[PDB]
Design a protein around this ligand. Structure first.
Ligand SMILES: O=C1CCCN1Cc1ccc(-n2nc(C(F)(F)F)c3c2CCOC3)cc1
Ligand SMILES: N[C@@H](CCC(=O)O)C(=O)O
Ligand SMILES: N[C@@H](CCC(=O)O)C(=O)O
Ligand SMILES: [Zn+2]
Ligand SMILES: [Zn+2]
Ligand SMILES: [Zn+2]
Lengths: 260, 262
């Protein structure tokens, strides 16, 4: 029995520092949906664990030239963590190098605007130039646009990849701040889960517009062939069927909502 | 050894698999059409196998008998070696995952309520608090098991009612449940997956609707026998087809493009 090293990422409301974190130690420093989920998964699988925050603050992408993975995916691939418990999107390129559990949450790519921005859809963004728009770096949303051969999305990528100044951001928090401070001239493409959370937080000045652009899931990731993968997968299904995943979503999204 | 034709188990459930109007003068896989027929062709293409569609003999999804411990339905066909793969609206569940493998999901769904239009019901809570309107589920499937196992008060109350209701509120097929809603003048509501509910909502005579939120959140997966050689490739194919947009295209094709209610 060794202590399982969990890689995760500071991303609200999945993993956040507690208000009084500087007087706390180890796993107790953190709170959120994924902190609660990690505790449940560990209990059902019978392991002790240490939450670590991913060194480079990234989800994970492969460098096209060196072929080296960064982010949480890299931490699994290179043996620096035993499991990733985070809002980590299940994707084909990742499933080729790590294992994922069945999904614990559904999501799709979505559009965040400052309230009153005259945009209702992806189509709307693609047909104009007044309002800039971008995505997170080193994540699945950027890759979605990079690979899409859907007319509207391909046009969006052509604009985004060459836009000056850069429309990409290092963290979700940076993307949201950019929307909030840009007086309606920046829209942000991000996962519906994070969009819907921010929509219910003060100062209540953003909103999700239009339908989701795709439909996918987050999964708990382990290194290819790991001894933990089987148990973790069954634990996710058990938590789903018990209603625990629904309980946690309600706890962290809507019970804590502050826009009424 | 040499490549063998893959036996695919599936179920006659609209719009996933249906008999073509002219099926008697067609052969083999060409007899059938639907979302799962289109998906099977794509999975087969991408994984590089030839296949034969077969309809599950007992017309069931899959449950384990309490007494005999024998699995029926498509799950049983995989467990007992009669089929190599199931391509169907088969729900990923823990009890099934213990005996077969599932791909990552190809379609999201949740348990939902179907009413005859005008029935004074807006929620599961509403059903649970009243007695004039009967309600039930497919008699062997993941929806029945959901209610059987739920520790949530509203759903426990519903199960306590359904399990003891006479005459039986359970049905043998989705089609039977839908017909029961339609003929019962608002006095029967049917608990079924959102996917099937939304499909029927777009079918003549346009007299049913889905009401309230979904009761749970889950998915359908492509299933293979435990440790099958096909599992890895099938899973990658699902993710590829998801990412390209094929799954969205197929849902629109079979649900909404051919909808009969505007
Ligand atoms: O809320 C929850 C918790 C338990 C599962 N659940 C609902 C759910 C259902 C399906 C998905 N997923 N997950 C994926 C994928 F694996 F990421 F590709 C795909 C879908 C649907 C479309 O096909 C791709 C994701 C979530
Ligand atoms: N969940 C994403 C990060 C957020 C995004 O790309 O929008 C990932 O796993 O890469
Ligand atoms: N998809 C379900 C059948 C339909 C239902 O139970 O509502 C299953 O796999 O058992
Ligand atoms: Zn638990
Ligand atoms: Zn580089
Ligand atoms: Zn194809």
């Amino acid at each position: 029995n060794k202590t399982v090293v969990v890689t995760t990422i500071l991303e609200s409301p999945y993993v956040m520092m507690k208000k009084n974190h500087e007087m706390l130690e180890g796993n107790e420093r953190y709170e959120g949906y994924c902190v609660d989920l990690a505790a449940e998964i560990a209990k059902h699988c019978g392991f002790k664990y240490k939450l670590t925050i991913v060194g480079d603050g990234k989800y994970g992408a492969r460098d096209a030239d060196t072929k080296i993975w960064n982010g949480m995916v890299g931490e699994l691939v290179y043996g620096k963590a035993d499991i990733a418990i985070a809002p980590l999107t299940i994707t084909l390129v990742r499933e080729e190098v790590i294992d994922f559990s069945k999904p614990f949450m559904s999501l799709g790519i979505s559009i965040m605007i400052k309230k009153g921005t005259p945009i209702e859809s992806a189509e709307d963004l693609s047909k104009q130039t007044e309002i800039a728009y971008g995505t997170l770096d080193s994540g699945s949303t950027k890759e979605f646009f990079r690979r899409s051969k859907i007319a509207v999305f391909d046009k969006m990528w052509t604009y985004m990849r060459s836009a000056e100044p850069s429309v990409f951001v290092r963290t979700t928090a940076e993307g949201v701040a950019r929307v909030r401070k840009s007086k309606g001239k920046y829209a942000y493409l991000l996962e519906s889960t994070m969009n819907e959370y921010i929509e219910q937080r003060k100062p209540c000045d953003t909103m999700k517009v239009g339908g989701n652009l795709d439909s996918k899931g987050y999964g708990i990731a382990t290194p290819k062939g790991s001894s933990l993968g089987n148990a973790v997968n069954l634990a996710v299904l058990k938590l789903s069927e018990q209603g625990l995943l629904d309980k946690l979503k309600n706890k962290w999204w809507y019970d804590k909502g502050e826009c009424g």
